[PDB]
Amino acid sequence: SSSSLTSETEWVGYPFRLFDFTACHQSYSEMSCSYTLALAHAVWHHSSIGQLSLIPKFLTEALLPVVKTEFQLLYVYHLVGPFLQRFQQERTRCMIEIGVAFYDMLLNVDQCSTHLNYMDPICDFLYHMKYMFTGDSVKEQVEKIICNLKPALKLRLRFITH
Amino acid sequence: VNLKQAILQAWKERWSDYQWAINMKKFFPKGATWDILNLAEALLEQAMIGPSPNPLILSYLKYAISSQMVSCSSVLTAISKFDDFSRDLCVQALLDIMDMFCDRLSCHGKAEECIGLCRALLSALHWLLRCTAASAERLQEKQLALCLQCLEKTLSSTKNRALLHIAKLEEASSWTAIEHSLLKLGEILANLSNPQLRSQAERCGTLIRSIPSMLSVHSEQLHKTGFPTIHALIL
Amino acid sequence: PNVLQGEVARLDPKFLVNLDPSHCSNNGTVHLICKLDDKDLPSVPPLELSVPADYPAQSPMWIDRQWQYDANPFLQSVHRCMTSRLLQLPDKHSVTALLNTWAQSIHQACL
Structure with a gap:
């Protein structure tokens, strides 16, 4: 998340092709960050019994003051997206x-x-x-959180209020 | 010549402006020609009255443009040296009439008159440039903003830009004259008159400079993806 | 559609219809430009795009209503009474009925 990846981001900027593995079908697009994402996918998958209980403290304690830009959030999403159903x-x-x-x-x-x-x-x-996945359980916690966003994101996620 | 006498007679009796069309179609054969016709009327009453509103003859001209090729009216208001008169009232009233043209459309000609409407629009833009140059004085309001507004309305994108592009390919001397006039107008566009003024004039200048280059220049971006085409062609 | 041809044949020499850039091969089959050339004051031609010529319907199109009618005071009054009169024709017919109604309204609102 902090190799440089943020200031030197690159003309690479396009996230969706970079993060997801199987992009190393060609010899190209073999970025060393995609390797770690694929390996974390495999590990969380085969270990999806009890070692997944460490990811909430991991996120809410370590990942907060190490994220400033948006593709870092996209990397966190590509990390902890598919295992939401396993949770x-x-x-x-x-x-x-x-x-x-x-x-x-x-x-x-x-x-x-x-x-x-x-x-x-x-x-x-x-x-x-x-x-x-959730329904209406995160509503009381997110009502006071979503309001501090930008007007564009607010107009987009307006429908969350239901 | 009979049209002048007919117009004077129609002035001697204040018509209801709908009987005027009937009387004009009756006095003339109504089928002989319409390009040997009213295209010279508009100037007489209004430009001649000069410092005067000149009522109901602009209304007769409106009911004329209701059924008339816009090319003739445009080349009329172009060939006329109205800015030489500079009453600051006749041209101000004529801009409201000219507003009706570019607002709706520049109708077809159904013939080789396409070049005619093209020349008409080009000369109309030149006359609007002369309007701005003459009205930007403000040595001591209304005209300096209304002329710019009518110019912006005439330079409506995707409709008349193609017409002006065709005009440029038709001849280049008029386009060079328009470029010189645009430079002369930008010379005064630096005069601090108001916040709205000297602000949209830059937009009009950019539009005029984009006219010759291209209308559909491939300026699109954000096509971020992989190109296997060159990857395979080099292989 | 031959049914439309019959009406264009039955038209008076005052009326005259034509065809614009036509989405009218066989189904719509019409969106014409009928100029009401007559003795009285002229006006703007309407489109009057009609359905299949079997006519379980009428024509009225009302395309150029936006700029043509609002621009003029007389043309504004032309549209007014003419709409109310067209809202009365029970199952109006394409060429003859609608064209005659348009001419009558144009020369009646003329007063």
Whole structure:
């Protein structure tokens, strides 16, 4: 998350092709950050029994003051996205913690940013994450959090108030 | 010549402006020609009255433009040296009439008159440039803003920009004259008159300078993706 | 559609219809430009795009209403009474009925 990745970001900027693995089908797009994402995917997958209970404290203690830009939030999303269903299987508690952690990272990047360009898929990502995983449980926690956002993100996520 | 006498007679009796069309179609064969016709009327009454509102003849001209090629009216208001008269009232009233042209459309000609409407629009833009140059004096308001407003309305994107592009390819001397006039107008566009003034004039200048280059220049971006085409062609 | 041809044949020499850039091969089959050339004052031609010529419907299109009618005071009064009169025709017919109604309204609101 901090190799440089932020200031020297690159003309590489385009996230969605970079983060996801199997981009190393060609000899190209073999960025060393994608390797770690794929390895973390594999580890969290085969270890998806009890070692996943360390991810909420990990996020809400370590990942907060190490994120300023938006593709860092996108990397965190590509890390802790697919395993949300594995969590919802039985570990229904940490769901709200991961959700409020995502909301806090969203606020942290919105408060420090010039333009939010790659946020359009993020809106519907969060939409479906609330729609098919949580429901109305994170509502009391996110009502006072979503309001501190930008007018664009506010107009987008307006429908969350229901 | 009979049209002048007909117009004087129509002035001697204040018509209801709908019987005027009937009387004009009756006095003339109504089918002989319409390009040997009213295209010379508009100037007489208004430009001649000069310092005067000149009522209901602008209304007769309006009901004329209701059924008339815009090319003739435009080349009329262009060939006329109204800015030489400089009553600051006749041109001010004529701008409101000219507003009706670019607002709705510049109708077809159904013939080779396409070049005619093209020349008409080009000369109309030149006359609007002369309007701005003559009205930007403000040595001591209304005209300096209204002329710019009518110019912006005439330079409506995607409709008349193609017409002006065709005009440039038709001949280049008029475009060079328009460029010289745009430079002369930018010379005064630096005069601090108001916040709104000297602000949209830059937009009009950018539009005029974009006219010749291209209307559909591929300026699109943000197509971030991988190109396998060159990757395979080099292989 | 031959049914429309019959009406264009039955038209008076005062009326004259034509075709614009036509989305009218066989289904719409019409959106004409009928100039009411007559003795009285002229006006702006309407479109009058009609349905299949079997006519379980009428024509009225009202395309150039926006700029043509609002611009003039007389043309504004032309539209006014003419709309109310067209809202009375029970199952009006494409060419003859609607065109005659338009001419009658144009020369009646003329007063």
